[model samples]
Target chain A: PERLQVYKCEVCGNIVEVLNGGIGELVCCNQDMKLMSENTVDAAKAKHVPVIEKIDGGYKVKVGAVAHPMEEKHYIQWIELLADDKCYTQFLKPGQAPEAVFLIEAAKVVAREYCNIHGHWKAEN
Target chain B: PERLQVYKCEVCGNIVEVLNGGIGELVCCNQDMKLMSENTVDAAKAKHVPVIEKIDGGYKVKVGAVAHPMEEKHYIQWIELLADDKCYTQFLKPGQAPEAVFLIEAAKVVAREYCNIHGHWKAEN
Candidate 1:
C-alpha cells in the first residue's frame, strides 16, 4: 500500500495529507493544529517538507487541511491550485491530490462558469 | 410583523441571520461569540428564545456566519443545510437565505450533483 502522511494547520485545526514524493512545507502556529494527532506530526516529518517551494510551472496555494467524512454541519472551503505564472489552474477537492494539471483544468471551469454566470461580454467593434 | 436576527462567528467574524421565528440555540464560547452582537445579540434575543428543538422535518444547522458581497481575492468555502442525518438535504447560497425551502432545494442539488460527480453508480448498478 502507498503510504500517506498527514499535515495540519496549527491555528485552525485543519488537516491534509502528503503523498508520493510530494515535497513542500507549511508554516502555521501551534494554536492552529490543536486537533492534530501524532500521526499528523509523523506524516509531516516524513515528507521532503520544503518552506513553501515555488515550483516552476506550479502555483502557490493557501489551503485548509481537513479530515474526511466531515460532519454534515461543518462548512468546507474551496481549494485551488494554480499554474507557475499564477494563471487559473485546478480546483482541488478536499482530501484529493493537489496536482498541477487538475488545478489548471478546474481553473478553466471556474473561469468559464464565472464569465457565463456574470454575463460578462467582450467589447465588440 | 416578522423579525430577523443576525449571528456571527466569534473567531472568524462570519455573519448570518435568523428569519421569522427561526428559533434555536447555538452554544458557542463567550470567547467564540465575541465577534457577535449588539446587532447580533439584539437579533438573537429578538426571536422567541428557546433551547434547540427537534423541529418537525426541518434540519438543524451549525453555520459559520458570513458577510456578503464577497471579494474575489478571498477563498470561499461551501455551506449547506440538512433536513433533519441531517439527511440528504439542500445546500445554501452565501448571503442568500436562511429560508427552509431554499436550503432544502440546495441540499437536493448537492445530493444529485455529488452522486453524479462521485460516480456513486447506485447499488443496483
Candidate 2:
C-alpha cells in the first residue's frame, strides 16, 4: 500500500491528490501538473509533522505531540490518512483541533498534514 | 482547461481531487482506486449540481438556483475551483452557506462540489 499521489500546477498553484492512477493525462493550463513530494523532516517537527495513533475504530492523526497552534495565522489546514489503499481527509479551521479521525483499520498507514505557512509534512506507521 | 480529476476508493469511502496531474500511481487498500464520474445531470439537479457565477475577483459557486440545505445530515462538504492551471478549494460545515468563493481570475473555470449524501456534482464556465 502507498500514499496517494498529490500534484500541483507549477504555473497556477493548483494542487490535486490522485485518487486513481493512470486514468488519463493530468493537465493544467495546457501543461503537465507536477508531482508534490511530502516533507517528512522539518525544523518545526514539534509543530508541523503529523503523528499517528491507533484508536478504537480507526486512527487518530495529530500534527504534533506538542499540539500545533490552531490560530488564524498559523494552523494545520488539513489532515490526511492513507490506510492501505484507501485515503481519508479532514479539513480544519481555526479554533479546532489540528487532528482528524479516520475510522479505518489497515496494516499500513501513512499520515500527512498541511500547514498554512509550513507547506506539507508526513509520517508513516 | 479541464476540471481536476477526482478518484474514489470503492473499497472505502475515501475520495480525492487532483490538483496536479500525472505525478504517479494512485493505489489504496492494496488495490487501485477508481476514477469518480461527476453527476452533471440528476433529478435533483437544482439541489445537487453546482452553478458558477463570475464575481469581481474570481467566481462564486453555488449549488442549484434554489439553495441546498446545510443541515447536519445533508450538506455540501466542499467546493472546488479549477481555474486555468490553478486549483482552489473551500471546505464547509453545517450552518454555513452551500457555496464557496475563489479569489482568482482565469480564462476557463470549472467548479465541483461534494455532498454528504448526494455524492459529487460539477459545472463549467
Candidate 3:
C-alpha cells in the first residue's frame, strides 16, 4: 500500500492526489484523470524535469541538474510531494524555480511537477 | 473591439477568457495566465495543434493536417473559441482531438486548444 499518489486531469491540466492510495478513478472535465510517471532523457524538449534531494530538515525538489527557467510565459506552475500518504504542494510564480522542500518521515517519496508548457513530470527518492 | 480573448494559467494549464475582450489580467492558482500564439515550425515538438474549418451546421475543429494522439498519457484536454465578444469552450476526454468548433457570427475569430502534454496553442482567423 502506498501513502500518497498523484493524478492529473488529462483534459484541463488539473492535478489531484489521494492519501493512502485511495481507490476509484480520478475524473476531471467529464473523464478520468491520468496518472503521471517519471520523465527524463528529453531535456531538449522537456527542460523542466523534477529532481528530488534529501535536505537537512526536509526534501528539496528542483528541476534538472541545471535549474529550470521561471518565466511568465513558460514556467513551472506547482510542485507536489507525496510522502507516503501525506501530500505537500508549493505554488510558484515567474522568476521562481520549480522547487520546494517538504518535511516528512518517509525514507523515500514521490515528487511531481506541473510545467505550464511541458505538462506533468515525476521523480522518486 | 474584440468579442472574446483567451488567457491560460501559466502554472496549472488552467485557461480562461474575457467575453468581448474584457480588460484586466486573468489569474489562476495565484498568478496571471499567459496568452498563447500559433506554433507551427516546431511540429516535432508541439504536434497537437488546433485546426478549424467550416462544416455543415457550425464549424469543425481538428488537430494538425494529420491528427493528434488522444491517449491517456498525452491528449487534448479542452478547446475554446473567442469570437469578437462571446466565448465558447469544449471539454474533451482522452482519445479526443485537440479541437473544438463554435457557432458564431464573426467571420474572423481566435481559437485556442489546451493539450494535456503540450500546454496551450492558438490560431486566428
Best-fitting candidate, scored by TM-score: 2
lDDT of 2 at A47: 77
Candidate 3's TM-score reads: 0.40
Best by DockQ: 2
Candidates 1 and 3, the one with greater lDDT: 3
Q: Docking quality tier of candidate 1?
A: incorrect
| Cα error, candidate 1, residue B24 (Å) | 24
TM-score of 1: 0.19
Clashes of each: 23, 10, 11
lDDT of 3 by residue, A1-125 (tens): 12234445545444433221223333445555455544632544345667789976568888755677889988876676665323445567788766776654568787777676666677788
Over the stretch B1-125, how does candidate 1's per-residue lDDT look in tens digits? 01112233334333322211212232223222211222222222212121121233332322212222222332112222222112222323345322222112122221110110111110100
Write down the lDDT of every candidate, Cα atoms only: 0.22, 0.68, 0.56
Tens-place lDDT per residue, model 2, B1-125, is: 12366666555555667532454545545455466668943549888778899987678899867799999988887777765334455667789899876655476887878786777788898
Error of 1 at A13 (Å): 6.0
Pick out the ten consecutive residues of candidate 2 chain B with the lowest summed lDDT: B19-28
Give the lDDT of residue B111 in candidate 1. Answer: 15
- Candidate 3 chain A, which ten residues in sequence have the lowest lDDT sum? A17-26
The TM-scores that each candidate's chain B achieves against the reference are: 0.21, 0.80, 0.65
- Global local distance difference test of model 2: 0.68
Model 2 segments beyond 4 Å from truth? A1-38, A41-125, B1-3, B20-25, B40-43
